[PDB]
Coordinates of C-alpha atoms in Angstrom, one line a residue:
Chain T
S1 CA 2.6 -7.5 -89.6
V2 CA 0.8 -5.8 -86.2
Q3 CA -0.9 -2.7 -87.2
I4 CA -1.6 0.2 -84.8
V5 CA -4.2 3.0 -85.7
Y6 CA -4.5 5.7 -83.1
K7 CA -6.7 8.7 -84.2
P8 CA -9.1 10.3 -81.3
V9 CA -11.0 13.2 -83.0
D10 CA -12.2 15.6 -80.3
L11 CA -14.9 18.1 -80.9
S12 CA -15.6 19.2 -77.4
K13 CA -16.3 22.6 -75.9
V14 CA -16.7 23.3 -72.1
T15 CA -18.5 26.8 -72.6
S16 CA -20.3 28.9 -69.9
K17 CA -22.2 32.1 -70.1
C18 CA -22.8 34.4 -67.2
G19 CA -24.5 37.8 -67.2
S20 CA -23.4 38.8 -64.1
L21 CA -21.7 37.3 -60.8
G22 CA -21.6 39.3 -57.8
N23 CA -22.6 40.4 -54.1
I24 CA -20.9 37.4 -52.4
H25 CA -19.9 37.9 -48.8
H26 CA -17.7 35.9 -46.5
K27 CA -17.4 36.5 -42.8
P28 CA -15.4 34.1 -40.8
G29 CA -14.6 34.4 -37.0
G30 CA -17.3 37.2 -36.1
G31 CA -17.3 36.2 -32.7
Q32 CA -15.1 37.2 -30.0
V33 CA -12.7 34.4 -29.4
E34 CA -11.0 34.0 -25.9
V35 CA -8.7 31.0 -24.5
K36 CA -7.6 30.9 -21.0
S37 CA -5.0 28.2 -19.8
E38 CA -3.6 27.9 -16.5
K39 CA -1.1 25.1 -15.4
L40 CA -0.9 23.0 -18.5
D41 CA 2.2 20.6 -19.5
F42 CA 3.0 19.5 -22.6
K43 CA 5.6 16.7 -23.6
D44 CA 5.3 16.7 -27.5
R45 CA 4.9 18.6 -30.9
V46 CA 2.1 21.3 -30.3
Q47 CA 0.5 22.8 -33.3
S48 CA -2.2 25.5 -32.1
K49 CA -4.2 28.0 -34.1
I50 CA -6.7 30.8 -32.8
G51 CA -8.5 33.3 -34.6
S52 CA -9.8 33.3 -38.1
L53 CA -7.3 30.9 -40.5
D54 CA -7.1 29.3 -43.8
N55 CA -10.5 31.0 -45.0
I56 CA -11.0 30.6 -49.0
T57 CA -13.4 32.9 -51.2
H58 CA -12.8 31.5 -54.3
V59 CA -14.8 33.1 -57.1
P60 CA -13.9 32.3 -60.7
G61 CA -15.7 33.9 -63.8
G62 CA -15.5 30.6 -65.5
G63 CA -14.4 27.5 -63.6
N64 CA -14.7 24.9 -66.8
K65 CA -12.5 22.2 -66.0
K66 CA -11.3 19.5 -68.7
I67 CA -9.1 16.3 -67.8
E68 CA -8.2 14.4 -70.7
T69 CA -5.6 11.7 -70.1
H70 CA -4.3 9.7 -73.0
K71 CA -2.3 6.3 -72.9
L72 CA -0.9 3.7 -75.2
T73 CA 1.1 1.1 -72.8
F74 CA 3.1 -1.4 -75.3
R75 CA 4.8 -4.0 -73.8
Chain L
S1 CA 7.3 -4.7 -89.7
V2 CA 5.6 -3.0 -86.9
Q3 CA 3.7 0.3 -87.8
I4 CA 2.9 3.1 -85.0
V5 CA 0.3 5.9 -85.9
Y6 CA 0.1 8.7 -83.6
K7 CA -2.2 11.5 -84.6
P8 CA -4.6 12.9 -82.1
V9 CA -6.2 16.1 -83.2
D10 CA -7.4 18.5 -80.7
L11 CA -10.3 20.9 -81.7
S12 CA -11.4 21.9 -78.1
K13 CA -12.0 25.4 -76.7
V14 CA -12.9 26.0 -73.0
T15 CA -14.3 29.3 -73.3
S16 CA -16.3 31.3 -70.7
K17 CA -18.1 34.7 -70.9
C18 CA -18.9 37.2 -68.0
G19 CA -20.8 40.5 -68.0
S20 CA -19.5 41.8 -64.7
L21 CA -17.6 40.0 -61.8
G22 CA -17.7 42.4 -58.9
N23 CA -18.7 43.1 -55.2
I24 CA -16.9 40.2 -53.8
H25 CA -16.2 40.8 -49.5
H26 CA -14.2 38.6 -47.5
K27 CA -13.9 39.7 -43.7
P28 CA -11.9 37.0 -41.6
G29 CA -11.0 37.8 -37.9
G30 CA -13.9 40.2 -37.3
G31 CA -14.0 39.1 -33.6
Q32 CA -11.4 40.0 -30.7
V33 CA -8.9 37.5 -30.0
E34 CA -7.7 37.0 -26.8
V35 CA -5.4 34.5 -25.2
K36 CA -4.1 34.0 -21.7
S37 CA -1.4 31.6 -20.6
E38 CA -0.3 31.1 -17.1
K39 CA 2.3 28.4 -15.5
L40 CA 2.3 26.2 -18.8
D41 CA 5.5 24.0 -19.9
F42 CA 6.5 22.9 -23.4
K43 CA 9.2 20.2 -24.2
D44 CA 9.0 19.8 -27.9
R45 CA 8.3 22.0 -31.4
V46 CA 5.9 24.6 -30.8
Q47 CA 4.4 26.4 -33.6
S48 CA 1.6 29.0 -32.7
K49 CA -0.7 31.1 -34.7
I50 CA -3.0 33.9 -33.3
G51 CA -5.0 36.5 -35.4
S52 CA -6.4 36.2 -39.0
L53 CA -3.8 33.9 -41.2
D54 CA -3.5 32.2 -44.5
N55 CA -6.8 33.9 -45.7
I56 CA -7.0 33.9 -49.6
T57 CA -9.8 35.8 -51.9
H58 CA -8.9 34.4 -55.4
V59 CA -11.0 36.1 -57.9
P60 CA -10.2 35.1 -61.8
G61 CA -11.7 36.9 -64.4
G62 CA -11.6 33.3 -66.3
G63 CA -10.2 30.5 -64.3
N64 CA -10.7 27.9 -67.6
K65 CA -8.1 25.0 -67.0
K66 CA -7.0 22.5 -69.4
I67 CA -4.7 19.6 -68.2
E68 CA -3.9 17.5 -71.3
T69 CA -1.4 14.6 -70.5
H70 CA -0.1 12.6 -73.4
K71 CA 2.1 9.4 -73.0
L72 CA 3.5 6.5 -75.6
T73 CA 5.7 4.1 -73.6
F74 CA 7.4 1.6 -75.8
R75 CA 9.6 -1.3 -74.1
Chain P
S1 CA -2.1 -10.2 -89.3
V2 CA -3.9 -8.6 -86.2
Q3 CA -5.4 -5.1 -87.0
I4 CA -6.2 -2.6 -84.3
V5 CA -9.0 -0.1 -85.3
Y6 CA -9.2 3.1 -82.7
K7 CA -11.2 5.8 -83.7
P8 CA -13.6 7.0 -80.7
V9 CA -15.5 10.5 -82.4
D10 CA -16.4 13.0 -79.4
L11 CA -19.3 15.4 -80.3
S12 CA -19.9 16.3 -76.5
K13 CA -20.9 20.1 -75.3
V14 CA -21.2 20.5 -71.3
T15 CA -22.7 24.0 -71.7
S16 CA -24.3 26.2 -69.0
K17 CA -26.2 29.3 -68.9
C18 CA -26.7 31.6 -66.2
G19 CA -28.5 35.2 -66.2
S20 CA -27.3 36.2 -62.7
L21 CA -25.5 34.3 -59.8
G22 CA -25.5 36.8 -56.9
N23 CA -26.4 37.4 -53.2
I24 CA -24.4 34.5 -51.8
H25 CA -23.6 34.8 -47.9
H26 CA -21.6 33.0 -45.9
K27 CA -21.0 33.9 -42.1
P28 CA -19.2 31.0 -39.9
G29 CA -18.4 31.5 -36.4
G30 CA -20.7 34.1 -35.6
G31 CA -21.1 33.1 -31.6
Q32 CA -18.2 34.1 -29.1
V33 CA -16.0 31.3 -28.6
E34 CA -14.3 30.8 -25.0
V35 CA -11.9 28.1 -23.9
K36 CA -10.9 27.5 -20.1
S37 CA -8.1 24.8 -19.3
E38 CA -6.9 24.3 -16.1
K39 CA -4.5 21.6 -14.9
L40 CA -4.0 19.5 -17.5
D41 CA -1.2 17.3 -18.6
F42 CA -0.5 16.1 -22.4
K43 CA 2.0 13.5 -23.4
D44 CA 2.2 13.2 -27.2
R45 CA 1.0 15.3 -30.3
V46 CA -1.1 18.0 -29.8
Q47 CA -3.1 19.5 -32.7
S48 CA -5.5 22.5 -31.4
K49 CA -8.0 24.8 -33.5
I50 CA -9.6 27.3 -32.3
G51 CA -12.1 30.2 -34.2
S52 CA -13.3 29.9 -37.6
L53 CA -11.1 27.4 -39.8
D54 CA -10.9 26.1 -43.3
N55 CA -13.9 27.9 -44.4
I56 CA -14.7 28.0 -48.0
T57 CA -17.0 29.8 -50.3
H58 CA -16.4 28.3 -53.9
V59 CA -19.0 30.2 -56.0
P60 CA -17.9 29.3 -60.0
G61 CA -19.1 31.1 -62.8
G62 CA -19.7 27.7 -64.7
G63 CA -18.3 24.8 -62.8
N64 CA -18.7 22.4 -65.9
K65 CA -16.6 19.1 -65.4
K66 CA -15.6 16.9 -68.2
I67 CA -13.2 14.0 -67.2
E68 CA -12.7 11.6 -70.0
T69 CA -10.0 8.9 -69.5
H70 CA -8.8 6.7 -72.7
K71 CA -6.7 3.6 -72.5
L72 CA -5.6 0.7 -74.7
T73 CA -3.2 -2.0 -72.8
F74 CA -1.7 -4.4 -75.1
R75 CA 0.2 -7.0 -73.8
Chain S
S1 CA -40.0 84.9 24.3
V2 CA -39.4 82.2 21.7
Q3 CA -36.0 80.3 22.1
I4 CA -34.1 78.3 19.5
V5 CA -31.6 75.9 20.4
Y6 CA -29.5 74.2 17.7
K7 CA -26.1 72.2 18.5
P8 CA -26.1 69.2 16.3
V9 CA -22.6 67.5 17.4
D10 CA -21.2 64.9 14.8
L11 CA -18.8 62.5 15.7
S12 CA -18.6 60.5 12.5
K13 CA -15.9 58.9 10.8
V14 CA -16.4 57.1 7.0
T15 CA -13.3 55.0 7.2
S16 CA -11.9 52.8 4.7
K17 CA -8.9 50.1 4.7
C18 CA -7.4 48.2 1.7
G19 CA -4.3 46.3 1.5
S20 CA -3.9 46.4 -2.2
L21 CA -6.2 47.6 -4.9
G22 CA -4.9 46.3 -8.5
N23 CA -5.0 44.2 -11.9
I24 CA -8.3 46.2 -13.2
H25 CA -8.9 45.7 -16.9
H26 CA -11.2 47.3 -19.3
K27 CA -11.3 46.5 -22.9
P28 CA -14.2 48.2 -24.8
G29 CA -14.7 47.6 -28.6
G30 CA -12.4 45.0 -29.3
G31 CA -14.6 43.9 -32.1
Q32 CA -14.3 45.6 -35.6
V33 CA -16.7 47.8 -36.4
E34 CA -18.1 48.4 -40.0
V35 CA -20.8 50.4 -41.2
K36 CA -22.1 50.8 -44.8
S37 CA -24.6 53.5 -45.9
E38 CA -26.2 53.7 -49.5
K39 CA -28.9 56.0 -50.5
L40 CA -29.8 57.5 -47.3
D41 CA -31.8 61.0 -47.0
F42 CA -31.7 62.9 -43.6
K43 CA -33.9 65.9 -43.0
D44 CA -33.2 66.9 -39.6
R45 CA -30.9 66.9 -36.4
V46 CA -28.2 64.0 -37.0
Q47 CA -26.0 62.8 -34.2
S48 CA -23.7 59.7 -35.1
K49 CA -21.4 57.7 -32.9
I50 CA -19.3 55.0 -34.3
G51 CA -16.1 53.2 -32.3
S52 CA -15.7 53.2 -28.6
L53 CA -16.9 56.4 -26.9
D54 CA -17.4 57.6 -23.3
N55 CA -15.8 54.5 -21.7
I56 CA -14.8 55.2 -18.0
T57 CA -12.6 53.5 -15.7
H58 CA -12.9 55.2 -12.4
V59 CA -10.7 53.4 -9.7
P60 CA -10.6 55.7 -6.6
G61 CA -8.4 54.6 -3.6
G62 CA -10.9 55.4 -1.1
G63 CA -14.4 56.7 -2.7
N64 CA -15.7 57.4 0.7
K65 CA -18.8 60.1 0.5
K66 CA -20.5 62.0 3.1
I67 CA -23.1 64.3 2.2
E68 CA -24.5 66.4 5.1
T69 CA -27.3 69.0 4.5
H70 CA -28.5 71.2 7.1
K71 CA -31.6 73.5 7.0
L72 CA -33.2 76.1 9.7
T73 CA -36.1 77.7 7.7
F74 CA -37.9 80.4 9.7
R75 CA -40.9 82.1 8.6
Chain M
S1 CA -43.0 80.4 26.1
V2 CA -42.3 77.9 23.6
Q3 CA -39.1 76.0 24.0
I4 CA -37.0 74.2 21.3
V5 CA -34.8 71.6 22.3
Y6 CA -32.3 70.2 19.2
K7 CA -29.5 68.0 20.2
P8 CA -29.1 65.1 18.0
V9 CA -25.8 63.2 18.9
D10 CA -24.3 61.1 16.3
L11 CA -21.8 58.2 17.1
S12 CA -21.7 56.3 13.8
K13 CA -18.8 54.7 12.0
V14 CA -19.5 53.2 8.2
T15 CA -16.3 51.4 8.2
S16 CA -15.0 48.8 5.6
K17 CA -12.1 46.4 6.0
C18 CA -10.5 44.6 2.6
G19 CA -7.5 42.7 2.3
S20 CA -7.2 43.1 -1.4
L21 CA -9.1 44.1 -4.1
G22 CA -8.2 42.7 -7.6
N23 CA -8.5 40.9 -11.0
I24 CA -11.6 42.9 -12.3
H25 CA -12.1 42.4 -15.9
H26 CA -14.7 43.9 -18.4
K27 CA -14.5 43.3 -22.1
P28 CA -17.5 45.0 -23.6
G29 CA -18.1 44.8 -27.5
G30 CA -15.8 41.7 -28.1
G31 CA -17.8 40.7 -31.3
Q32 CA -17.6 42.1 -34.9
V33 CA -20.4 44.6 -35.4
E34 CA -21.8 45.1 -39.0
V35 CA -24.5 47.6 -40.3
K36 CA -25.8 48.0 -43.7
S37 CA -28.4 50.4 -44.7
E38 CA -29.8 50.7 -48.1
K39 CA -32.8 53.2 -49.2
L40 CA -33.6 54.8 -45.9
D41 CA -35.5 58.0 -45.4
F42 CA -35.3 60.0 -42.1
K43 CA -37.7 62.8 -41.3
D44 CA -36.8 63.9 -38.0
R45 CA -33.8 63.9 -34.9
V46 CA -31.9 60.8 -35.5
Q47 CA -29.8 59.6 -32.6
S48 CA -27.3 56.6 -33.8
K49 CA -24.9 54.8 -31.8
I50 CA -22.7 51.7 -32.8
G51 CA -19.8 49.9 -31.2
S52 CA -18.9 50.0 -27.3
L53 CA -20.3 53.1 -25.8
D54 CA -21.0 54.0 -22.2
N55 CA -19.2 51.4 -20.5
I56 CA -18.3 51.7 -16.5
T57 CA -15.7 50.0 -14.5
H58 CA -16.1 51.6 -11.1
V59 CA -13.9 49.8 -8.8
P60 CA -13.8 51.9 -5.4
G61 CA -11.3 50.8 -2.7
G62 CA -14.2 51.9 0.0
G63 CA -17.6 52.8 -1.2
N64 CA -19.2 53.7 2.1
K65 CA -21.7 56.2 1.9
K66 CA -23.6 58.0 4.5
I67 CA -26.4 60.6 3.5
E68 CA -27.9 62.5 6.7
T69 CA -30.5 64.9 6.1
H70 CA -31.3 67.2 8.9
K71 CA -34.6 69.6 8.9
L72 CA -36.4 72.0 11.4
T73 CA -39.3 73.7 9.4
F74 CA -40.9 76.2 11.7
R75 CA -43.9 78.3 10.2
Chain E
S1 CA -46.1 76.3 28.2
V2 CA -45.3 73.6 25.3
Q3 CA -42.0 71.9 25.7
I4 CA -40.3 70.2 23.2
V5 CA -37.7 67.4 23.7
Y6 CA -35.5 66.0 20.8
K7 CA -32.3 63.7 21.8
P8 CA -32.1 61.0 19.1
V9 CA -28.9 59.1 20.3
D10 CA -27.4 57.0 17.5
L11 CA -24.9 54.4 18.3
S12 CA -24.9 52.4 14.9
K13 CA -22.1 50.9 13.0
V14 CA -22.6 49.4 9.3
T15 CA -19.4 47.7 9.4
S16 CA -18.1 44.9 6.9
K17 CA -15.3 42.7 6.7
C18 CA -13.4 41.0 3.6
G19 CA -10.4 38.8 3.3
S20 CA -10.4 39.1 -0.5
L21 CA -12.5 40.2 -3.4
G22 CA -11.3 39.4 -6.8
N23 CA -11.7 37.4 -10.2
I24 CA -14.9 39.2 -11.5
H25 CA -15.4 38.8 -15.2
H26 CA -17.8 40.8 -17.4
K27 CA -18.1 40.1 -21.2
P28 CA -20.9 41.6 -22.6
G29 CA -21.5 41.6 -26.5
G30 CA -19.1 38.4 -27.2
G31 CA -21.3 37.7 -30.2
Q32 CA -21.2 38.9 -33.6
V33 CA -23.9 41.6 -34.3
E34 CA -25.0 41.9 -37.9
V35 CA -27.8 44.5 -38.7
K36 CA -29.2 44.9 -42.9
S37 CA -32.0 47.3 -43.5
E38 CA -33.5 47.8 -46.9
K39 CA -36.2 50.4 -48.1
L40 CA -37.2 51.8 -44.7
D41 CA -38.9 54.9 -44.0
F42 CA -38.9 56.9 -40.6
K43 CA -40.9 59.9 -40.3
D44 CA -40.1 60.5 -36.3
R45 CA -37.5 60.6 -33.8
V46 CA -35.3 57.7 -34.1
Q47 CA -33.1 56.5 -31.3
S48 CA -30.6 53.6 -32.6
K49 CA -28.3 51.6 -30.5
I50 CA -25.8 48.7 -31.6
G51 CA -22.9 46.9 -30.3
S52 CA -22.5 46.6 -26.2
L53 CA -23.5 49.8 -24.5
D54 CA -24.4 51.0 -20.8
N55 CA -22.5 48.0 -19.4
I56 CA -21.5 48.5 -15.5
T57 CA -19.2 46.4 -13.3
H58 CA -19.6 48.3 -10.2
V59 CA -17.2 46.4 -7.3
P60 CA -17.3 48.5 -4.1
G61 CA -14.6 47.5 -1.3
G62 CA -17.4 48.2 1.2
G63 CA -20.7 49.2 -0.2
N64 CA -22.2 50.0 3.3
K65 CA -24.9 52.6 3.0
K66 CA -27.0 54.2 5.7
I67 CA -29.7 56.6 5.1
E68 CA -31.0 58.5 8.0
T69 CA -33.3 61.3 7.3
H70 CA -34.8 63.5 10.2
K71 CA -38.0 65.9 10.0
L72 CA -39.9 68.0 12.6
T73 CA -42.4 69.9 11.1
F74 CA -44.3 72.3 13.5
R75 CA -47.2 74.1 12.4

């Protein structure tokens, strides 16, 4: 008879310590933005974006990640 | 007879410590934005975006993630 | 009879220590941006982006990652 | 006997002709203006000006000037 | 006997002709203006100016000037 | 007896002709302007100017000048 044993013990600790996390600045699109269009002709899907777009300031206290994937395929 | 044993013990701790988390600034689209269009001709789907759009300031106290996926396919 | 033994013990610790994490600056698109178009002719999908876009200031307190993948294929 | 003759004839004409005078634009202070003061100490007259100030758009139809000064000092 | 003759004839004409005078633009201070002061100490007259100031767009239809000064000092 | 003759005839004409005078642009201070001061100490008159200042767009239809100065000193 076939015997399957599966006992993965996990004694992990993704710790982080931080005294202070501050004084982050993010200034996108400081400069003047000018666009000037004359006698154009479009014929298909036009996606246009002007100014300051999709700007992210992600500041997480921790940010510790743990990705654990378990698998046991038995055909 | 087939024996299946499945006992994954999990002694994890995704801790984080932070004294202070402050003074984050985010200024998108500071500059003047001017657009000037003359004698254009569009013929399909037009998506247009001007100014400061889709700007994110995500500031989580923690931000600790744990993704654990378990699977046991038995054909 | 076939014997399968599977006991991976994990005594890991992806620690990090930080006294202070501060004074980060990010200024994209400081300069004036001018565009001037005259007598153009487009005939297909146009994606246009002007100004300061998709700028990221990721500042995580920790940032410790642990990717552990386990597999046990048995045909 | 002393004879004084004073007959300055003036056949001047400071004319101007203009078909059309239009489409003047004046946009001062388009950009965002930020000021941040911390732990200052003033001890005398403080004159402070922020934003868009003392901006002039003088557009005169004519603008023809004639300054004529006459004098006849007799000691 | 002393004879004084003074007859300056003036047949001047400071003319100007203009079909059209248009499409003047003036954009001062397009860019974002940031100031950040910390632990300063002033002791005398402080004149401070931030943003877009004292900007002039003088557009006169004519602008013809004639300065004529006449003098006849007799001691 | 002393004879003074003074008859300056003036048959001048400072003309100008212009079909069209247009499409003048003036964009000062397009760029983002940042100032950052820390632990300064002033002791006398401080004149400070930030941003776009004293910008002039003089566009006169004519601009013809005539300066005529006449003098007749007699001691």
